[PDB]
Design a protein around this ligand. Structure first.
Ligand SMILES: *P(=O)(O)OCC(C)(C)[C@@H](O)C(=O)NCCC(=O)NCCS
Lengths: 50, 99, 72, 49
């Protein structure tokens, strides 16, 4: 039982951590860049209006 | 002087319109991107808000390193491997969500 | 038409269905558009009709009815 | 490669370095060269590696 559980725990830990890192990174960069573009657009809009 | 300044104003108007259009398209795409992860991926796994304070370069670099490892990790499952390999295309991001 | 272009824009800027977006469908509650979502929605609406809205006049708009009213 | 932008080059380099880290666990020498070269501002380092 110990062997089975150890093997499966290690495998799931590894795969989950790697996949999460990989995919959340691209997601979060998309999000941050969209936010930054919005911020830049707001700055431009305010300066243009002024 | 004022006319000279209005010249720069018009240039800036053009720039702002461009930025506006770009952000519009970005939001339109992100809508479907979100509605993919909207299926219970967002909460704690795919969204990681602590990462909000870094730039595209670092995120992409670490993503590439993670993929370099994961591809060897996913050597087994052919269809999961295919999802990974295809989503490897940065131009079509939500693939990686589906993967 | 304008009254359907508005729904198209609102939907694909919030992801909400065409049915959910009635004239009275308030964005923040009915469509769940938050601060940045509302800003992006007004941005896309300005793009759709290549027109600009005053800051206070733009923020005043918070409902599909008010949005169309200002647009038309 | 002149016909691609810097972002693509950076992505490719990092993607290669990932598999390199996985593989190099065998040899100390290549591992040391890697652990020194991976920093950006030391291209010569990578070359030695
Ligand atoms: P959300 O809670 O992130 O809020 C976004 C925002 C309403 C603060 C933003 O869209 C905004 O309006 N920023 C600019 C405000 C303004 O009128 N600034 C003056 C010109 S720079």
């Amino acid at each position: 039982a110990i062997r089975v559980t150890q093997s499966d725990r290690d495998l799931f830990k590894h795969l989950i951590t790697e996949a999460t890192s990989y995919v959340s990174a691209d997601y979060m960069r998309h999000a941050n860049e969209r936010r930054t573009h919005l911020d830049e657009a707001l700055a431009l809009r305010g300066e243009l209006f002024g | 002087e004022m006319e000279n300044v209005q010249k720069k104003l018009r240039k800036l108007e053009r720039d702002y319109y461009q930025i506006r259009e770009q952000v519009v398209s970005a939001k339109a795409g992100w809508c479907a991107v979100m509605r993919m992860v909207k299926d219970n991926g967002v909460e704690r796994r795919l969204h990681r808000r602590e990462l909000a304070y870094m730039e595209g370069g670092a995120l992409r670099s670490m993503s590439d390193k993670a993929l370099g490892a994961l591809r060897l990790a996913v050597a087994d499952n052919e269809h999961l491997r295919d999802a990974l390999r295809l989503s490897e295309d940065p131009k079509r991001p939500e693939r990686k969500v589906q993967f | 038409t304008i009254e359907e272009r508005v729904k198209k824009i609102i939907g694909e800027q919030l992801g909400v269905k065409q049915e959910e977006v009635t004239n009275n469908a308030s964005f923040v509650e009915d469509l769940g558009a938050d601060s940045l979502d509302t800003v992006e929605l007004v941005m896309a609406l300005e793009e759709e009709f290549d027109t600009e809205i005053p800051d206070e006049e733009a923020e005043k708009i918070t409902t599909v009815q008010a949005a169309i009213d200002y647009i038309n």
